[PDB]
């Protein structure tokens, strides 16, 4: 709370972090990886043919399933692949970004006991402009100091380029690879043409059918409007399946708040009418009622893509000016202190800025530990499916 508030006033120090935030959020925002992630892990989970569909949902064996809805499978395997494709090739990338900013923090700023790279360009200046030094220290300092410089401008290059690739691999996310690879907008558009399909011929053909569908609709807005109001997280991030596949999963840690539990509860009469429930309405309100909770998540895969390549863009023009100052510092400014014999506002700069890199070093590392870690199918919901209230009778 009252780290974000010191990064943003650090932002303008010379040498520093600059301004490592999104919002209230520290750059690398634990509460919307973690929620991202729920949307992905559902996403995993999707059923792609007949039999997945129905012991998903968990509808009866005796049920008969109408031909329309078979236009579901074929979206839902690209969104699944695309759930994959997500796992494999752009979550690790930030968990790599935010361990590069923690080992720049470290370096730099020093042990929480021990001395910093920045230390050690202190007391280089010292012996530079110490009347005392012969020139071989001199010849020495400006050596050693140099090469160190030279250092971070070269793994600051290396994180400007890696946040540059994150960059592009949320573009393919978004818009596919060129591959086989289909983009988020094409299954976006493709899930909400079969919503409003399957909604008109199979929504609305029974009071209840628009009542309970409707109450899922409700449930999703309210379960949604608490998720994006948490804001904090203080645990380590799991995955549950309580709410079922009507709603999909969620952070276990949103569990322990009050509103959701209560949905839980609600979700469970629910069951308890569709599972006695007249056939048809029973089926078309677990398909249609999952399939729109689907379409509000890839809704908000969509744009949240767009607002992480935002910030990911902003990481990368923070690691060039990193690197720019750097070599400016090594150069032009270290010149400046052979010329002048003086250090001195260089030394307080850097003790400034070793400060602020602790605090993001520190968020960094949080995130980090914080963070969750570890078309045949499906193997995946098979875990899920033993552990939901939803499948048991």
């Known amino acids: 709370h009252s780290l974000i508030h010191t990064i943003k ?13 999104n919002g209230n959020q520290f750059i690398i925002s634990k509460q919307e990886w973690a929620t991202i992630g729920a949307y992905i892990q559902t996403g995993l989970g999707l059923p792609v043919n007949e039999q997945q569909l129905r012991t998903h949902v968990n509808l009866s064996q005796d049920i008969s399933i109408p031909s329309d809805f078979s236009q579901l499978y074929d979206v839902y395997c690209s969104d699944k692949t695309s759930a994959e494709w997500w796992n494999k090739n752009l979550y690790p990338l930030i968990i790599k970004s935010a361990n590069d ?33 012969d020139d071989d220290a001199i010849a020495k300092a400006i050596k050693d100091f140099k090469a160190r410089c030279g250092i971070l401008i070269k793994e600051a290059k290396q994180y400007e380029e890696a946040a540059k690739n994150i960059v592009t691999s949320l573009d393919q996310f978004l818009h596919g690879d060129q591959k086989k690879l289909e983009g988020v907008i094409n299954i976006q558009k493709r899930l909400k043409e079969v919503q409003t399909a399957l909604n008109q011929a199979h929504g609305e053909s029974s009071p209840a059918h628009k009542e309970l569908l409707e109450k899922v609709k409700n449930l999703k807005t309210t379960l949604e409007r608490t998720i994006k109001a948490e804001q904090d997280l203080e645990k380590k991030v799991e995955y549950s399946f309580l709410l079922g596949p009507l709603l999909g999963f969620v952070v276990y840690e949103i569990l322990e708040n009050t509103a959701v539990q209560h949905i839980k509860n609600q979700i469970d009469e629910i069951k308890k009418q569709l599972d006695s429930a007249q056939h048809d309405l029973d089926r078309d309100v677990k398909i249609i009622g999952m399939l729109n909770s689907i379409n509000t998540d890839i809704d908000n895969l969509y ?11 902003k990481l990368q023009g923070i690691w060039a000016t990193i690197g720019a100052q750097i070599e400016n510092l090594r150069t032009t400014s270290l010149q400046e202190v052979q010329d002048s014999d003086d250090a001195d506002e260089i030394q307080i700069e850097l003790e400034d800025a070793s400060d602020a890199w602790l605090v993001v070093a520190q968020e960094a590392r949080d995130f980090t530990l914080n963070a969750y870690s570890t078309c045949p199918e499906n193997n995946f919901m098979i875990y899920w499916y033993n552990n939901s209230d939803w499948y048991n009778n």
């Open 9 to 21: 006033l650090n932002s303008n120090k010379k040498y520093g972090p600059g301004d490592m935030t």
């Open 101 to 133: 900013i923690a080992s720049y923090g470290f370096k730099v700023a020093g042990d929480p006991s021990i001395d910093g790279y920045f230390k050690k360009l202190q007391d280089e200046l010292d012996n530079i402009v110490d009347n005392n030094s």
């Open 303 to 313: 744009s949240q893509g767009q607002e992480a390549i935002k910030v990911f863009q």
